[PDB]
Design an enzyme around this catalytic site. Structure first.
Site, PDB file in Angstrom:
ATOM      1  N   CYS A   1      97.742 152.928 -19.814  1.00  0.00           N
ATOM      2  CA  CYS A   1      97.613 154.275 -20.296  1.00  0.00           C
ATOM      3  C   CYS A   1      97.942 155.195 -19.090  1.00  0.00           C
ATOM      4  O   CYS A   1      98.439 154.702 -17.995  1.00  0.00           O
ATOM      5  CB  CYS A   1      96.124 154.489 -20.753  1.00  0.00           C
TER       6      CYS A   1
ATOM      7  N   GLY B   1      90.898 154.605 -18.328  1.00  0.00           N
ATOM      8  CA  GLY B   1      90.066 155.059 -19.448  1.00  0.00           C
ATOM      9  C   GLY B   1      90.426 154.365 -20.746  1.00  0.00           C
ATOM     10  O   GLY B   1      89.677 153.481 -21.140  1.00  0.00           O
TER      11      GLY B   1
END
Length: 267
Positions: free
Chosen positions: A201, A206
């Site tokens: 990501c 996260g």
């Protein structure tokens, strides 16, 4: 059990290689860096390059088929080539992309695959996109990867590009992520002795951490059944010892418990 007994707030190794001057422009974010002890070390680099062994990526080992992960950031323009050297070297056959290329006008990952029915060379690596399949929550891209000029080095790399993660927060229902993870699970198990699953990501902490922790927990339930001991904080800490900061927000934390509870309901 997938009950939340502890709050997110209770959750809270050197990074020398990522801090080197030669590596500064290989990091999307200046102080999100890989731990040395688990970083992916890239071999066979261009001998004209003083530093060619670095990418912002860590192997994550859960600690039953033994499955591992590479958690990494979205490619920058100058790290696409190194990203394909990593996938090749590690024998990775499945990539999980959890972002758009650009979200709210900020780049999260440079496009590192060719369009459907095209091939491109990214440094010494040749990548052919032979077929896309566009499903409700994701697009699957069937990529063929080989080293340029080199005979019989081709292997299929399946890129699962999740499309429905909201730009704010987390999905309000985990059904899309659980169907996506189940297809990644079957794909990885269908390929003899495949290497680590790559997950990325924007920063590789996260969303990447939320995906990897859910997958680890579900795989425990595969082995041990729905009544097995689950300890989500203990698992998050165990992943955090291998890449800094995995699972960034309280919504992501809540989403992990919701996803595992829903998985259990399915059985």
């Amino acid at each position: 059990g997938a009950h939340m007994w502890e709050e997110f707030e209770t959750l809270q190794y050197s990074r020398k290689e990522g801090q080197r001057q030669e590596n500064k422009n290989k990091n999307r974010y200046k102080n999100i860096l890989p731990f040395d002890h688990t970083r992916v070390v890239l071999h066979d680099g261009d001998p004209n390059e003083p530093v060619s062994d670095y990418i912002n990526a860590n192997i994550i080992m859960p600690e039953k088929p033994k499955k591992s992960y590479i958690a990494t950031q979205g490619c920058l323009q100058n790290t696409v080539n190194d990203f394909w050297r990593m996938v090749f070297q590690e024998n990775s056959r499945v990539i999980v992309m959890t972002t758009k290329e650009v979200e709210r006008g900020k780049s999260k990952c440079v496009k590192y695959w060719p369009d459907e029915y095209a091939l491109k060379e990214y440094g010494v690596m040749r990548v052919r996109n032979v077929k896309e399949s566009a499903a409700h929550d994701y697009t699957l891209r069937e990529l063929k990867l080989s080293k340029v000029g080199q005979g019989n080095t081709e292997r299929t790399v399946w890129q699962y590009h999740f499309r429905t993660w909201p730009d704010h927060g987390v999905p309000s229902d985990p059904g899309g992520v659980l169907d996506f993870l189940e297809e990644v699970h079957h794909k990885q198990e269908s390929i003899m002795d495949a290497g680590p699953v790559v997950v990325h990501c924007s920063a590789g902490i996260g969303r990447t951490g939320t995906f990897i922790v859910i997958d680890i927990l579900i795989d425990i339930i595969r082995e041990k059944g729905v009544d097995r001991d689950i300890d989500v904080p203990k698992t998050i800490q165990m992943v955090r010892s291998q890449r800094s900061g995995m699972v960034q927000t309280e919504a992501q934390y809540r989403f992990i418990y919701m996803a595992v509870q829903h998985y259990i309901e399915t059985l």
